[PDB]
Short mmCIF file of C-alpha atoms in Angstrom, two decimals:
data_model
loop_
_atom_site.label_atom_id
_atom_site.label_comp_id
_atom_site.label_asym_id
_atom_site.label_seq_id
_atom_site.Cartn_x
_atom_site.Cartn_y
_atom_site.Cartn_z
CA UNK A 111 0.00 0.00 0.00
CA UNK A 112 2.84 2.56 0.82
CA UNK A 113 4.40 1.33 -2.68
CA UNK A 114 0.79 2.09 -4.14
CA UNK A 115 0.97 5.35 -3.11
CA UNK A 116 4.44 6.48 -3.25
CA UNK A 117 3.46 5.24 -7.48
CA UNK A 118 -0.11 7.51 -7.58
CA UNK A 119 1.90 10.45 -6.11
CA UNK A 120 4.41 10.26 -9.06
CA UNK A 121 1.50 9.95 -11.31
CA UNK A 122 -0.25 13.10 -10.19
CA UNK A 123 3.31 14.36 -10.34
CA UNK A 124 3.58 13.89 -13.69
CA UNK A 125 -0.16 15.13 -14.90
CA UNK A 126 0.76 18.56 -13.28
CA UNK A 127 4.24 18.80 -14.58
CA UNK A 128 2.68 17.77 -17.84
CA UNK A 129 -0.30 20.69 -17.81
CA UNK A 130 1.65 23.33 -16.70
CA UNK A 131 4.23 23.25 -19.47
CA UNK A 132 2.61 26.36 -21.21
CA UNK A 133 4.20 29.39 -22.50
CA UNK A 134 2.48 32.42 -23.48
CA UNK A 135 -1.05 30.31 -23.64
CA UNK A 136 0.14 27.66 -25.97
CA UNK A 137 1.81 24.49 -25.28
CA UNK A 138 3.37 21.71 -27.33
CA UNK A 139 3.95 19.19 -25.25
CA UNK A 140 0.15 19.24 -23.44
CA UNK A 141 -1.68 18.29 -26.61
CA UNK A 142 -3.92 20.69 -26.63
CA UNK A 143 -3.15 21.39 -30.72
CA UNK A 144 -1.87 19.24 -33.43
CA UNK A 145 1.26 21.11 -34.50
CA UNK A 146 2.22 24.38 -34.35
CA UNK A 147 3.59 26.23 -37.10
CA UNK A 148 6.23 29.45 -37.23
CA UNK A 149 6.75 32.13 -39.42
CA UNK A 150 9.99 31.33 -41.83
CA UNK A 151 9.82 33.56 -45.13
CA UNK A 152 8.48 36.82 -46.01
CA UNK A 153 6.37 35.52 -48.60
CA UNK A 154 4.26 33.72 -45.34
CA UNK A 155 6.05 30.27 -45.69
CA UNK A 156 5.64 27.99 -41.83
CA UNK A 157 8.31 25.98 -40.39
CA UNK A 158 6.17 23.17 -39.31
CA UNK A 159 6.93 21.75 -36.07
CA UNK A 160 4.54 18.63 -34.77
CA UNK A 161 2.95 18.55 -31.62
CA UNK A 162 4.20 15.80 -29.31
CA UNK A 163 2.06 14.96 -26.10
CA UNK A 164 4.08 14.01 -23.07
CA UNK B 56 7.82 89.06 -81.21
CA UNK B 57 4.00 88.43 -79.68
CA UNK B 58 4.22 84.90 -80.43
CA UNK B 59 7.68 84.83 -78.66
CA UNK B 60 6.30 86.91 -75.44
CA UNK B 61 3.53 84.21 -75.28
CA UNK B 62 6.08 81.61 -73.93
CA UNK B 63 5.68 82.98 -70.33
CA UNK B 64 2.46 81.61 -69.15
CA UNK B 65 3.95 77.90 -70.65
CA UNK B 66 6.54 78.41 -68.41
CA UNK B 67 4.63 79.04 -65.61
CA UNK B 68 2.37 76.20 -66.33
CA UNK B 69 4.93 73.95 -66.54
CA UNK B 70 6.18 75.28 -62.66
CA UNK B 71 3.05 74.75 -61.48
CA UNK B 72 2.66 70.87 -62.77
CA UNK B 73 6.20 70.19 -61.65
CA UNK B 74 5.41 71.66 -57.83
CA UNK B 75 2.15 69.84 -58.10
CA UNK B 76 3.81 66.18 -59.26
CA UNK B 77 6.35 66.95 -56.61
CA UNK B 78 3.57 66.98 -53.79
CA UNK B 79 2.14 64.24 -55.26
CA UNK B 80 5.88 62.28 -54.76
CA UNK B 81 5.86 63.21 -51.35
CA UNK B 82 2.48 61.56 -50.31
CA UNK B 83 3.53 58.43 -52.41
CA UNK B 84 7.29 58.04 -50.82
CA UNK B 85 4.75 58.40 -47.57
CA UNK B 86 2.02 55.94 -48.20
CA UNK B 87 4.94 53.43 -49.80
CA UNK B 88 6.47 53.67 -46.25
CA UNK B 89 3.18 52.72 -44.70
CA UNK B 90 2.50 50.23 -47.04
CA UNK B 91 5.88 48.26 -46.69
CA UNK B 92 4.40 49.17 -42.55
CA UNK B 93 1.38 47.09 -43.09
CA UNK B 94 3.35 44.50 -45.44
CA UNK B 95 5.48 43.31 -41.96
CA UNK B 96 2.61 43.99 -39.40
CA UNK B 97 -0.10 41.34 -41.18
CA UNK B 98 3.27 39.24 -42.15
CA UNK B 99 3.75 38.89 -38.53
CA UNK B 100 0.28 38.51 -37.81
CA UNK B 101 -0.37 35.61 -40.46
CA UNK B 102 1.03 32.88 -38.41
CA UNK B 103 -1.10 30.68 -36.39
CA UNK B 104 0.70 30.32 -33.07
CA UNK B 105 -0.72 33.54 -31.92
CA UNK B 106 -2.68 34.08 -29.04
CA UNK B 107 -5.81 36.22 -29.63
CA UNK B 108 -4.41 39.23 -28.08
CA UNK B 109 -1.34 39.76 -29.90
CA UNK B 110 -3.63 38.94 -33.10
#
């Protein structure tokens, strides 16, 4: 049982470490969008970058 | 002699049009400024990692 919740501890750990990886309102790592995509030529060309969920 | 004292009022005329164009250059060097302005403000409002704010 102490094992048990030393291990849901780490968990809930892990969910808030996890949701509060934000900066300036968006987050890449929280999965809260798809990708995200960055400005990379004046004619309006992205530089992709892929969203991945930790 | 009359037809050669004529040529003042071209002359003038042509002064006129020149100061006239010349104002006209001055808004457009102006409103090209503000246009190359507005060509980097919606350039760096065109990408989608925005928040609304900034947007």
């Amino acid at each position: 049982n102490a094992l048990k919740s030393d291990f849901d501890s780490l968990r809930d750990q892990i969910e808030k470490a996890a949701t509060n990886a934000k900066f300036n309102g968006v987050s890449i790592a929280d999965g809260s969008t798809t990708k995200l995509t960055f400005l990379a030529n004046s004619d309006g060309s992205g530089f992709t970058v892929n969203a991945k969920t930790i | 002699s009359a037809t050669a004292a004529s040529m003042n009022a071209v002359k003038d005329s042509l002064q006129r049009g020149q100061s006239t164009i010349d104002v006209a250059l001055a808004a457009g060097d102006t409103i090209t400024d503000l246009l190359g302005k507005m060509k980097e403000k919606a350039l760096a409002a065109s990408d989608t990692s925005l928040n609304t704010a900034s947007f």
